[PDB]
Design a protein around this ligand. Structure first.
Ligand code: FAD
Ligand code: 38C
Length: 455
């Protein structure tokens, strides 16, 4: 299939801040190189940015009045090796495609986000994190090389420790602003099964949620995350359903499943909105029997689960989740600032803004990428319905997050200011200097670049 350059109205996943750009779409690498050579001959214009599957909520994969390059047609898996654990894939392959192709080799995608519909390029450019951050770091940690199409029209082969480690690490979490990742080699995690052994716990309050994450139990699990109550007044505020686990070995599987330990099950036809259309509430739900039931069902040990059960637990709730019109907000607060983190949770609950879907986890050590989002500490994602006062309230949350040494995530943001973002990322000047060195003419530009003064 040939090249196609179309004027397209683009938004992130949040369906907000739309802007019109020329979308180039081609499986031909030579053609992508030529477009970048074209933009650069100009050589100052409104530039270009790569786009993956558009799963970022904000404006990092759009470029109003300029060019956008859709990378999804470059989706070749070149090789997978079980012995070296390395995969060599085009930047356009997505993590679901990769997971499925790698399982028969006993290989596991080392960092999986809450949706598998993300490209390798998008996973690198946002240095994405998953349920295992505290044990495996973020996506960038597992990249062994990548080929970066730079502004000068050349393709630079980058490694994390080689000659241009600096450019490598500016590209990790760089939001497409150092060039176009064409291709990458990733080191996979070995596995004997496609299953998890999981322990579930239900806490009664915010204080309990924090204690559970601070009692040392986190180190017994490679994977850990929680669903968090952000609407109930204290003491119920910040109670959580915690899901922790690790990949199962074949010995740990029931005999029924040992025949095909690496098998991935197809997603079921029926979801919970399908079997129970008008909700799951009864007369017991919100009283003491409801609390007991919820606590009992969410407390367990050594439960064998496939990926969907362990890792995408709310796929069950199907049509019920988020029912556009929502603002996604994710931040992390450094571990030591526990009181400050608790204070921010209190602010949210008293705001008059109600988020039903709240993902909580304790991040581990950060990496050397100057713009990487994750830092060790308390991470949470909340989802606010758009309504009066919200924009001004999230600006107040920004101030609180900043003051308490934390940051927002670019993959979620469409509204923070440049001033706020720069203070949240003290290594931003260091990063900008790398960018100016590798792209003096601003061949690469995006709506986010301009909003956040990263240009
Ligand atoms: C339901 C849902 C759940 C999510 N859960 C998580 C989670 O648990 N953890 C997490 O970290 N994130 C999560 N995300 C965010 C998502 O993982 C990131 O936004 C990711 O970057 C999206 O990948 P994409 O291919 O859709 O990239 P896009 O949104 O299309 O692009 C994002 C950025 O990547 C850059 N980029 C894309 N391809 C290339 C390339 N080839 N070369 C250079 N730059 C490139 C773009 O220019 C842009 O700056 C979630 C998103 C959704 C919608
Ligand atoms: C359709 O219903 C669903 C089902 C699953 C999800 C998972 N979402 C998410 N899970 C996340 C999990 C983490 C984790 F676990 F901390 F790594 C971090 C960010 C996350 N962000 C999101 C997001 O929404 O952007 C979101 C909506």
């Amino acid at each position: 299939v040939g090249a196609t350059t179309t004027a397209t109205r683009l938004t992130g996943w949040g369906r907000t801040a739309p802007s019109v750009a020329n979308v180039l779409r081609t499986p031909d690498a030579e053609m992508i190189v030529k477009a970048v050579a074209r933009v650069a001959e100009s050589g100052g214009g409104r530039g270009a940015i790569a786009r993956g599957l558009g799963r970022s909520y904000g404006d990092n994969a759009q470029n109003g009045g300029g060019l956008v390059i859709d990378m999804t047609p470059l989706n070749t898996i070149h090789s997978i090796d079980a012995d070296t654990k390395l995969v060599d894939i085009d930047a356009g392959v997505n993590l679901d495609q990769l997971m499925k192709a790698a399982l028969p080799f006993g290989l596991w995608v080392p960092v999986l986000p809450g949706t598998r519909q993300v490209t390798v390029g998008g996973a690198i450019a946002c240095d994405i994190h998953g349920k295992n951050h505290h044990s495996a770091g973020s996506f960038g940690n597992h990249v062994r090389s990548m080929d970066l199409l730079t502004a000068d029209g050349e393709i630079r082969h980058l490694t994390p420790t080689g000659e241009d480690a600096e450019l490598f690490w500016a590209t990790v979490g760089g939001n497409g602003l150092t060039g176009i990742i064409m291709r990458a080699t990733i080191e996979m995690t070995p596995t004997s099964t496609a299953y998890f052994i999981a322990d579930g716990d239900v806490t009664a309050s915010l204080d309990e949620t924090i204690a559970l994450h601070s009692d040392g139990s986190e180190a017994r699990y490679t994977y850990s995350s929680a669903w968090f109550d952000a609407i109930s007044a204290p003491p119920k505020l910040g109670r959580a359903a915690v899901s922790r686990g690790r990949l199962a070995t074949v010995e740990q599987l029931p005999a029924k499943l040992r025949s095909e330990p690496l098998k991935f099950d197809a997603p079921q036809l029926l979801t919970l909105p399908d079997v129970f259309p008008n909700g799951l509430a009864n007369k017991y739900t919100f009283g003491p029997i409801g609390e007991l039931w919820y606590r009992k069902s969410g407390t367990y040990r050594g439960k064998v689960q496939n990926l969907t059960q362990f890792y995408h637990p709310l796929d069950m709730f199907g049509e019920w989740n988020r029912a556009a019109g929502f603002l996604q907000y994710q931040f992390v607060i450094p571990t030591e600032a526990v009181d400050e983190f608790k204070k921010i949770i209190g602010v949210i609950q008293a705001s008059g803004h109600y988020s039903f879907l709240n993902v909580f986890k304790l991040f581990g050590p950060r990496n050397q990428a100057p713009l990487s989002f994750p830092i060790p500490g308390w991470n949470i994602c909340v989802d606010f319905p758009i309504k009066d006062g919200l924009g001004k309230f999230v600006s107040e949350l920004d101030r609180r997050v900043l003051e308490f040494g934390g940051r927002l995530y670019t993959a979620k943001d469409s509204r923070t200011t440049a001033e706020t973002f720069h203070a949240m990322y003290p290594r931003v000047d260091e990063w900008i200097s790398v960018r100016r060195k590798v792209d003096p003419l601003r061949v690469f530009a995006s709506d986010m670049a301009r909003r956040l003064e990263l240009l």
